[PDB]
Design an enzyme around this catalytic site. Structure first.
Site, PDB file in Angstrom:
ATOM      1  N   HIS A  22     -18.023   9.225  33.863  1.00  0.00           N
ATOM      2  CA  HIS A  22     -19.113   8.047  33.984  1.00  0.00           C
ATOM      3  C   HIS A  22     -18.994   6.339  34.455  1.00  0.00           C
ATOM      4  O   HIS A  22     -18.871   5.867  33.899  1.00  0.00           O
ATOM      5  CB  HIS A  22     -19.190   7.866  31.823  1.00  0.00           C
ATOM      6  CG  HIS A  22     -20.099   8.940  31.617  1.00  0.00           C
ATOM      7  ND1 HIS A  22     -18.931   9.571  30.589  1.00  0.00           N
ATOM      8  CD2 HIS A  22     -21.748   9.896  31.552  1.00  0.00           C
ATOM      9  CE1 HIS A  22     -20.022  10.767  29.885  1.00  0.00           C
ATOM     10  NE2 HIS A  22     -21.220  11.010  30.632  1.00  0.00           N
ATOM     11  N   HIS A  78     -20.857   9.063  39.156  1.00  0.00           N
ATOM     12  CA  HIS A  78     -21.804   9.779  38.640  1.00  0.00           C
ATOM     13  C   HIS A  78     -23.681   9.116  38.163  1.00  0.00           C
ATOM     14  O   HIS A  78     -24.668  10.083  38.408  1.00  0.00           O
ATOM     15  CB  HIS A  78     -21.663   9.807  37.023  1.00  0.00           C
ATOM     16  CG  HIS A  78     -23.002  10.694  36.116  1.00  0.00           C
ATOM     17  ND1 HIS A  78     -23.235  11.751  35.976  1.00  0.00           N
ATOM     18  CD2 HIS A  78     -23.242   9.826  34.882  1.00  0.00           C
ATOM     19  CE1 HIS A  78     -23.917  11.800  34.821  1.00  0.00           C
ATOM     20  NE2 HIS A  78     -24.003  10.660  34.549  1.00  0.00           N
ATOM     21  N   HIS A 103     -27.888   3.780  33.989  1.00  0.00           N
ATOM     22  CA  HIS A 103     -27.991   4.468  32.594  1.00  0.00           C
ATOM     23  C   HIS A 103     -26.722   4.284  31.865  1.00  0.00           C
ATOM     24  O   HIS A 103     -27.005   4.287  30.053  1.00  0.00           O
ATOM     25  CB  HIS A 103     -28.585   5.548  32.485  1.00  0.00           C
ATOM     26  CG  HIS A 103     -28.208   6.299  33.013  1.00  0.00           C
ATOM     27  ND1 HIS A 103     -27.691   7.340  34.069  1.00  0.00           N
ATOM     28  CD2 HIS A 103     -26.867   7.862  32.468  1.00  0.00           C
ATOM     29  CE1 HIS A 103     -27.262   7.904  34.712  1.00  0.00           C
ATOM     30  NE2 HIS A 103     -26.926   8.642  33.236  1.00  0.00           N
ATOM     31  N   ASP A 104     -25.224   4.000  32.750  1.00  0.00           N
ATOM     32  CA  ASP A 104     -24.148   4.587  32.046  1.00  0.00           C
ATOM     33  C   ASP A 104     -23.852   3.160  32.142  1.00  0.00           C
ATOM     34  O   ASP A 104     -21.900   2.877  32.414  1.00  0.00           O
ATOM     35  CB  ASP A 104     -23.674   5.639  32.633  1.00  0.00           C
ATOM     36  CG  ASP A 104     -24.103   7.210  31.649  1.00  0.00           C
ATOM     37  OD1 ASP A 104     -24.576   6.822  30.349  1.00  0.00           O
ATOM     38  OD2 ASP A 104     -23.852   8.317  32.733  1.00  0.00           O
ATOM     39  N   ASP A 130     -29.405  13.589  34.898  1.00  0.00           N
ATOM     40  CA  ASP A 130     -28.009  13.372  34.302  1.00  0.00           C
ATOM     41  C   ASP A 130     -27.031  14.145  34.149  1.00  0.00           C
ATOM     42  O   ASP A 130     -25.961  14.198  34.434  1.00  0.00           O
ATOM     43  CB  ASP A 130     -28.137  12.247  32.760  1.00  0.00           C
ATOM     44  CG  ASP A 130     -27.279  11.807  32.184  1.00  0.00           C
ATOM     45  OD1 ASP A 130     -26.382  11.671  33.028  1.00  0.00           O
ATOM     46  OD2 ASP A 130     -26.632  12.241  30.615  1.00  0.00           O
ATOM     47  N   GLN A 178     -18.894  25.493  27.524  1.00  0.00           N
ATOM     48  CA  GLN A 178     -20.157  25.067  29.008  1.00  0.00           C
ATOM     49  C   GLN A 178     -21.402  26.330  28.685  1.00  0.00           C
ATOM     50  O   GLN A 178     -22.236  26.129  29.311  1.00  0.00           O
ATOM     51  CB  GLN A 178     -19.135  25.317  30.135  1.00  0.00           C
ATOM     52  CG  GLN A 178     -18.274  23.690  31.034  1.00  0.00           C
ATOM     53  CD  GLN A 178     -19.415  23.244  31.089  1.00  0.00           C
ATOM     54  OE1 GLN A 178     -20.742  22.562  30.453  1.00  0.00           O
ATOM     55  NE2 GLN A 178     -19.071  22.599  32.140  1.00  0.00           N
TER      56      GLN A 178
HETATM   57  C1  PD4 Z   1     -16.497  20.587  31.121  1.00  0.00           C
HETATM   58  C2  PD4 Z   1     -15.762  20.102  29.859  1.00  0.00           C
HETATM   59  C3  PD4 Z   1     -16.453  20.646  28.431  1.00  0.00           C
HETATM   60  O1  PD4 Z   1     -18.231  20.828  28.765  1.00  0.00           O
HETATM   61  C4  PD4 Z   1     -18.637  21.256  27.647  1.00  0.00           C
HETATM   62  C5  PD4 Z   1     -20.554  20.989  27.839  1.00  0.00           C
HETATM   63  N1  PD4 Z   1     -20.762  19.899  26.972  1.00  0.00           N
HETATM   64  C6  PD4 Z   1     -20.361  20.063  25.087  1.00  0.00           C
HETATM   65  O2  PD4 Z   1     -20.364  21.472  24.706  1.00  0.00           O
HETATM   66  C7  PD4 Z   1     -21.216  18.779  24.760  1.00  0.00           C
HETATM   67  N2  PD4 Z   1     -21.059  18.982  23.405  1.00  0.00           N
HETATM   68  C8  PD4 Z   1     -21.147  18.040  22.564  1.00  0.00           C
HETATM   69  C9  PD4 Z   1     -22.939  17.625  22.427  1.00  0.00           C
HETATM   70  N3  PD4 Z   1     -23.214  16.531  21.206  1.00  0.00           N
HETATM   71  C10 PD4 Z   1     -22.648  15.132  20.898  1.00  0.00           C
HETATM   72  C11 PD4 Z   1     -24.682  14.487  20.921  1.00  0.00           C
HETATM   73  O3  PD4 Z   1     -25.799  15.139  19.996  1.00  0.00           O
HETATM   74  C12 PD4 Z   1     -25.117  16.584  20.079  1.00  0.00           C
HETATM   75  C13 PD4 Z   1     -24.644  17.632  19.963  1.00  0.00           C
HETATM   76  N4  PD4 Z   1     -21.544  18.052  25.938  1.00  0.00           N
HETATM   77  C14 PD4 Z   1     -21.138  17.454  26.526  1.00  0.00           C
HETATM   78  C15 PD4 Z   1     -21.602  16.789  27.803  1.00  0.00           C
HETATM   79  C16 PD4 Z   1     -22.037  17.251  28.776  1.00  0.00           C
HETATM   80  C17 PD4 Z   1     -21.476  17.977  29.504  1.00  0.00           C
HETATM   81  C18 PD4 Z   1     -20.990  17.818  30.807  1.00  0.00           C
HETATM   82  C19 PD4 Z   1     -22.230  17.570  31.833  1.00  0.00           C
HETATM   83  C20 PD4 Z   1     -22.261  17.623  33.256  1.00  0.00           C
HETATM   84  C21 PD4 Z   1     -21.526  18.731  34.050  1.00  0.00           C
HETATM   85  O4  PD4 Z   1     -21.420  18.958  35.356  1.00  0.00           O
HETATM   86  C22 PD4 Z   1     -20.295  20.245  35.583  1.00  0.00           C
HETATM   87  N5  PD4 Z   1     -20.377  19.509  32.925  1.00  0.00           N
HETATM   88  C23 PD4 Z   1     -20.623  19.237  31.703  1.00  0.00           C
HETATM   89  N6  PD4 Z   1     -21.209  18.629  28.712  1.00  0.00           N
HETATM   90  C24 PD4 Z   1     -21.117  19.240  27.662  1.00  0.00           C
HETATM   91 MG    MG Z   2     -24.697   8.214  28.565  1.00  0.00          MG
HETATM   92 ZN    ZN Z   3     -25.130   9.993  32.542  1.00  0.00          ZN
END
Ligand code: PD4
Ligand code: MG
Ligand code: ZN
Ligand code: MG
Length: 324
Positions: free
Chosen positions: A78, A82, A118-119, A230, A283
Site C-alpha cells: 500500500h 499501488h 485512496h491509501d 483496487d 488466494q
Molecule cells: C497474497 C497474500 C495472501 O492473500 C490472500 C488473499 N487475501 C485475503 O485472504 C484477504 N483476507 C482478509 C479479508 N477480510 C478483511 C476485511 O473484511 C473482510 C474480510 N485480504 C486480501 C486483501 C488483498 C489481497 C490481494 C490484493 C491484490 C493481489 O494482487 C496480486 N493479491 C491479493 N488479498 C487478500
Molecule cells: Mg486501502
Molecule cells: Zn488500495
C-alpha cells in the site's frame, strides 16, 4: 522538493499510446517515479480533465508529487505504486472498458483523484491492528473504516494545500459534489463496505434494474468500480500478479511481525509468515469469494471490461494448481 516539481512540469508528456496506460495488462515495474508521474498527467489530460476544469499545469504537477510523497516508502504493497496502478486501471476501465461513456466529467475527476489518493499514508497495518493497539485514529472514527477515513483526511489536506489546489477552478456546487464523490469512493475501498453493499449491486444487474440515472445506483456503481480497480493486480498477467502478490504477502507478514512483538499474539494465518504455506489456498478463496463476482458484474455492465475477468479466472487456475 522544488527541483522535482520543476523537472516534472518542464517534461514532455508522452502519449497514452507510448505509455501503454490504456492496457489492462499494464505494468509499472520498469517505470521510474518520474515516468509514473508523467503517466498520471496523461491520465488527467486524455480524460479531458485538465481542459474541462481549467487546471494549471504546475498545480497538477505539485499535487501529484504531493500525493506521491504522502505514501510511505517502507510499506510493501500500500504505497504510491499501488495507488498509481489503481489510477491506471481506472483509466483503462474508463477508456478501453468504455465506462467513461456512463459517467459525468465530475464523476471521472473524482474517481481519478480517489484512485490516486485512496491509501494515502497507509501504515502497512490493517484497521483491526489500529483498533487493537488503541490508535488515536480508531478513536476519532469509532473503529469504522479507520484507515479509509484517514486516507480521505489526507486527501483533503493535500487538496487544501497551497499550490496543490487542483479543484480551485470548480464552481462551488461542483466542488462540494466532487468532494462527496471522493469521500464515498475512498471509503468504498474498505473491503468490509464492499461485502456489505455488493449484494444490492449484483441483484440490480440480475433483475435488469441497473440504472445509472438513479443517484443511489450511481454511488453504488462508483464504489464497486473502486473495489474493482483496487483489487486489479489480482487480474494481471501471471508474472506481474505473482510479483505483486509477493508484496501483498510481505506487508501482511510485516504486520504479523509487529503483532508478535507488540501484542505477543500468534498472528492470523494471513499475517503469519510461519504459515506462508496458506497463501495459495487463501488466494483461491479470496478470488472465489470476493473477486470473481465483481469482475463478472463489471463485465455485465460493460463487456469491454472482460480482460479483468479473464485475467482473474486465469490467475485463479494458476493459484489452484499450486494449492491442490
Ligand atoms: C497474497 C497474500 C495472501 O492473500 C490472500 C488473499 N487475501 C485475503 O485472504 C484477504 N483476507 C482478509 C479479508 N477480510 C478483511 C476485511 O473484511 C473482510 C474480510 N485480504 C486480501 C486483501 C488483498 C489481497 C490481494 C490484493 C491484490 C493481489 O494482487 C496480486 N493479491 C491479493 N488479498 C487478500
Ligand atoms: Mg486501502
Ligand atoms: Zn488500495
Ligand atoms: Mg453549479
Amino acid at each position: 522538493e522544488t527541483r522535482e516539481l520543476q523537472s516534472l512540469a518542464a517534461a514532455v508528456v508522452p502519449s497514452a499510446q507510448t505509455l501503454k496506460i490504456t492496457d489492462f495488462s499494464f505494468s509499472d515495474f520498469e517505470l521510474s517515479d518520474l515516468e509514473t508521474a508523467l503517466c498520471t498527467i496523461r491520465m488527467f489530460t486524455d480524460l479531458n480533465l485538465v481542459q474541462n476544469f481549467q487546471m494549471k499545469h504546475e498545480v497538477l504537477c505539485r499535487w501529484i508529487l504531493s500525493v506521491k510523497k504522502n505514501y510511505r516508502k517502507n510499506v510493501a504493497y500500500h504505497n504510491w505504486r499501488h495507488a498509481f496502478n489503481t489510477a491506471q486501471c481506472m483509466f483503462a476501465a474508463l477508456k478501453a472498458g468504455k465506462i467513461q461513456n456512463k459517467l459525468t466529467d465530475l464523476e471521472i475527476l473524482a474517481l481519478l483523484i480517489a484512485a490516486l489518493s485512496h491509501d494515502l499514508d497507509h501504515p502497512g497495518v490493517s484497521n483491526q491492528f489500529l483498533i487493537n493497539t488503541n490508535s488515536e485514529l480508531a478513536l476519532m472514527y469509532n473503529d469504522e473504516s479507520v484507515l479509509e477515513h484517514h486516507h480521505f483526511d489526507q486527501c483533503l489536506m493535500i487538496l487544501n494545500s497551497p499550490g496543490n489546489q487542483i479543484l480551485s477552478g470548480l464552481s462551488i456546487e461542483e466542488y462540494k459534489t466532487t468532494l462527496k464523490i471522493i469521500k464515498q469512493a475512498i471509503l468504498a475501498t474498505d473491503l468490509a463496505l464492499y461485502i456489505k453493499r455488493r449484494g444490492e449491486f449484483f441483484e440490480l444487474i440480475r433483475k435488469n434494474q441497473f440504472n445509472l440515472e438513479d443517484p443511489h445506483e450511481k454511488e453504488l456503481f462508483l464504489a464497486m468500480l473502486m473495489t474493482a480497480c483496487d483489487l486489479s493486480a489480482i487480474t494481471k498477467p501471471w508474472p506481474i500478479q505473482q510479483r505483486i502478490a509477493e508484496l501483498v504477502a510481505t506487508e501482511f507478514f510485516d504486520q504479523g511481525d509487529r503483532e508478535r512483538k507488540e501484542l505477543n499474539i500468534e498472528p492470523t494465518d494471513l499475517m503469519n509468515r510461519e504459515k506462508k504455506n496458506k497463501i495459495p489456498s487463501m488466494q483461491v478463496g479470496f478470488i472465489d469469494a470476493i473477486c470473481l463476482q465483481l469482475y463478472e458484474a463489471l463485465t455485465h455492465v460493460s463487456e469491454d471490461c472482460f480482460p479483468l475477468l479473464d485475467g482473474c479466472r486465469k490467475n485463479r487456475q494458476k493459484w489452484q494448481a499450486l494449492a491442490e
